[PDB]
């Protein structure tokens, strides 16, 4: 809407500067100004994007544990009274968390994932339709909660099934998006032996290949391998 | 402490 | 507008909730709600205001500089042409900084200063009238900055006198009137020596006093005297 | 480097 009379250019250059002065709510403005010209997205831009609005829904995130953790507080036996002011305001910030959540998932169905054909592009895509049904889930209840935890268990794994035939065990897409779905399992799905299984094997069969990479492609995959051996550290 | 996922680019 | 059918009393305590969650935006029109409910403000309530226009004002601040520095980069000899984006995207930031300013302003004319009778009430809106003139100043050129500096130093000059005559030189507000009274003569108004003169001046009298507090007042005091000290150390 | 102005609250 507000963005359709400014260039796709500017609107990615006025991105890059919204990323340099930490204004994150602008950058996902642009970028979503940027993805609704209707042309696919580069590698850069596609990075921006996720930067973006990773950043606006990292802080929805923690705004939203803060508050859960004081309603949670104020609903024990021997807690005084208060009113409804705190189930409000938690409430306020999930709905515009939700809010957030959908306005990306409705980027990729129209119509990022369906226009990209490369592997690179696709999981990229599907990692991120995972994610952000991920964030879903952390604040969902109920019913609810079983269909949403399912479309991130989708998404994930027809990103994983991707991953596994067309990038090799290094690749840092593939490298995330095994990371990631190893924290759906532990911390949403309550499958910790998957989550486990998983990084162990993905950080075992990413070591094997390590001899083929350059210095600069090196140093992105250990940083990686690095995470999934961290949560296997925090888990065992 | 809740696990880590994939930093931002 | 928005929060006139919320109870003051629930806008304070969802107000208390958003500094917890790091929303500043979110306690800033908190506050905003409970002012125009039209009572005074208690010195809880007036910190709260405080915290809240601060922290939002000092986003936009940092954003600002670095935004004014990459276009000051773009307007230098040898540098290439990229068009108005920088230009434009920075007036952006500076056009919701402004607002943000006389939203503060409006509030304090409002009618929190006129119906500000103790010194410690009347001595703390007029500082913070200072203060949002002075945001405004940095941002402001021509004949356009000369006007907003002078209400700077009206507002600030109001603050010290009745701040002298009514409250003790250890006082953290008196201090702080002081050390932002200074910030503005080095920094907005041309004036290191003056600057210099405050701040020596301010630090001597407090030092002469400290025997009269207790221990929670020694410290507040003294840790706006250390800052009192830090900027004489920059400025000399 | 900037000058120093009061803290938050
Ligand atoms: C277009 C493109 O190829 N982007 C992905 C690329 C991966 C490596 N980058 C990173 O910033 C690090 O890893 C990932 C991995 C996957 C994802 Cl989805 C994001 C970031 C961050 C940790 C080390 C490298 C740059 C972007
Ligand atoms: C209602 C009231 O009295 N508020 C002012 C009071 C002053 C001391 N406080 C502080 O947080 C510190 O100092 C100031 C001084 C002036 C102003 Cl306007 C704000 C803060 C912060 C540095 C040490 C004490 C609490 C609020
Ligand atoms: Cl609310
Ligand atoms: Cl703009
Ligand atoms: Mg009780
Ligand atoms: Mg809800
Ligand atoms: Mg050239
Ligand atoms: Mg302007």
Tied chains: 1, 3.
């Excluded at chain 1, 994930?156 to 998006?177: C, F, H, V, W």
Aim: hydrophobic content about 35%.
């Amino acid at each position: 809407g507000a963005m359709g009379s400014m260039e796709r250019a500017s609107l990615i250059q006025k991105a890059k500067l919204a990323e340099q002065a930490e204004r994150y709510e602008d950058m996902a403005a642009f970028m979503k100004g940027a993805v609704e010209k209707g042309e696919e997205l580069s590698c850069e831009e596609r990075n921006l994007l996720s930067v973006a609005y990773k950043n606006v829904v990292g802080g929805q995130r923690a705004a939203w544990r803060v508050l859960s953790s004081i309603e949670q507080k104020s609903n024990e036996e021997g807690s005084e009274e208060k009113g409804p002011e705190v189930r409000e305001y938690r409430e306020k910030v999930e709905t515009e968390l939700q809010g957030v959540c959908d306005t990306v998932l409705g980027l990729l169905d129209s119509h990022l994932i369906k226009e990209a054909g490369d592997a690179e592009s696709r999981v990229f895509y599907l990692k991120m339709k995972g994610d952000y049904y991920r964030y879903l889930a952390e604040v969902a209840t109920g019913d609810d909660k079983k269909r949403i935890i399912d479309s991130a268990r989708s998404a994930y794994q027809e990103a994983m099934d991707i991953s596994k035939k067309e990038m090799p065990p290094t690749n840092p897409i593939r490298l995330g998006l095994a990371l990631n779905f190893s924290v759906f399992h532990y911390e949403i799905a309550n499958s910790p032996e998957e989550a486990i299984s998983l990084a162990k094997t993905t950080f075992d069969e990413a070591m094997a290949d390590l001899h083929t990479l350059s210095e600069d492609s090196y140093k992105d995959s250990t940083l990686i391998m690095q995470l999934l051996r961290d949560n296997l550290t925090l888990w065992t | 402490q809740r696990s880590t996922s994939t930093p931002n680019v």
